[PDB]
Design a protein around this ligand. Structure first.
Ligand SMILES: C[As](C)(=O)[O-]
Ligand SMILES: [Cl-]
Ligand SMILES: [Cl-]
Ligand SMILES: [Mg+2]
Lengths: 189, 189, 189
């Protein structure tokens, strides 16, 4: 099996990486944006089952909850679905401030890598995409926030997920997108 | 010399990587977009001649052809040029469905790295960019598509390219940008 | 402690990397954009003090100076500030032409990683963000330009910065965003 690192209490394989496309640096409260995010096997160990997790983090307030935004996603060429609030981690409060909401966005990918039994194996060099639609409710703002892509994997076939609500017992390399939720910049000239 | 990996029947050097800037997650049919893509030598072997290849992929249909889109590019500081359909690979059809069209975007870079003899060497840490204009014809859509960046390189001076229509006998690390070709998202609220 | 590579006359630790969010591939002269940029410790050596440097590069002209654009930034959840022209490197002129202007954008991050003594240590997996507002004066254009992210670190606490005007005596992995400064693309159809 592959080499894992310890981070908090979890096992991380940096060879499974994630990339964002189309995240804006400023998001307007109330408006819907669409971006894509995808994880790729940059190693040589083929995982038997995989799925994406998305983390939304506010650094400057701790009152954000799952119900403060609407979240839809589509795994590659499968159909759109609404992200399930039951498949989220409970709010986490880092000692450095803020709160983050981790949401599972897994499932079949339209039969590209996914198999009849529902698994999404991930051979080397291959990738899985989530097209993601996101909107925060009006009336909430943050001056330093982030979306994080947290790829999840099952190391061995038959393994169970280890964080309640999220996919995987091991995880890939965390990828970040920093943004502000608020008003865009006024003209400097 | 550098170490290569096998992928299909080709040689890949993961130290030559590519990055996209400004690709949108949703592209309107008929509309022209501009993005940039660039490849960087993150290794220590200086390549004698290099050029970018671009792949357009639809996962949910197989009728896309080179004639269905218009494509222009400029290599770093050189002038714009129309991409040559003769310098493309034939449509490729993955066993899981869909189609992709690989298009060569090579040429001198405006005298930054390029040499009088026409080659574009790539010393370590240096990079080459393509500014890219792209438009799909109206009446064609895809709900899960991608642009892939495929850096191509000549291992030795005087080598010949190995995929007909594309540049290079060895290749860098494939980079992806997933998007949809269709209508932007309606409001979630 | 970490291993460094030589580049020009400086020391580079490729484990400190940087990512861009929201840079457009075409910037309108006179218009203000906001993007984000952040550096992440992908290694295991915790640097005692860190800060971001940003380089603005035109490849096709050499008359650009710091006074030709306006530049503001905000380190994570700290406050907005105007970038200080005295904390810039002198204009640098590549032998092939063009000019680039390197600007320091360091400072505390709102007490996320920053400490009372003002330092910004960077433990493993952690990151620091700069939200950036940028505008070029109208009447200036470039057909191949770039923003470069240059993380600076102080290896060991007592070290002093090695490039006057910039933060750090060692540096992280340079990250690029290529763009044009001018008019957007006219329709190809
Ligand atoms: C309509 As025809 C796609 O086969 O160019
Ligand atoms: Cl050839
Ligand atoms: Cl930070
Ligand atoms: Mg370049």
């Amino acid at each position: 099996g592959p080499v894992y690192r310890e981070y908090k209490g979890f096992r991380v394989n940096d060879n499974i990486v994630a990339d964002f496309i189309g995240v804006p640096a400023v998001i307007t409260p109330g408006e819907t944006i669409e971006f894509s995010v995808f994880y790729t096997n940059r190693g040589r160990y083929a995982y038997p089952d995989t799925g994406m997790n998305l983390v939304i983090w506010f650094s400057d307030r701790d009152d954000l909850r799952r119900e403060d935004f609407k979240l839809f996603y589509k795994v590659s060429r499968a159909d759109w679905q609404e992200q399930d609030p039951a498949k989220c981690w409970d709010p986490q409060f880092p000692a450095e401030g803020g709160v983050h909401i981790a949401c599972q966005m897994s499932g079949p990918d339209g039969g590209i890598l996914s198999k009849p039994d529902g698994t999404v194996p991930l051979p080397e060099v291959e990738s899985v995409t989530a097209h993601v639609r996101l909107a925060f409710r009006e009336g909430i703002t943050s001056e330093h926030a982030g979306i994080f892509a947290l790829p999840g994997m099952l190391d061995a076939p038959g393994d169970k997920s280890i964080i309640p609500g999220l996919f995987g017992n091991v995880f890939g390399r965390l990828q970040q997108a920093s943004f502000r939720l608020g008003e865009g910049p006024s003209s400097l000239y």
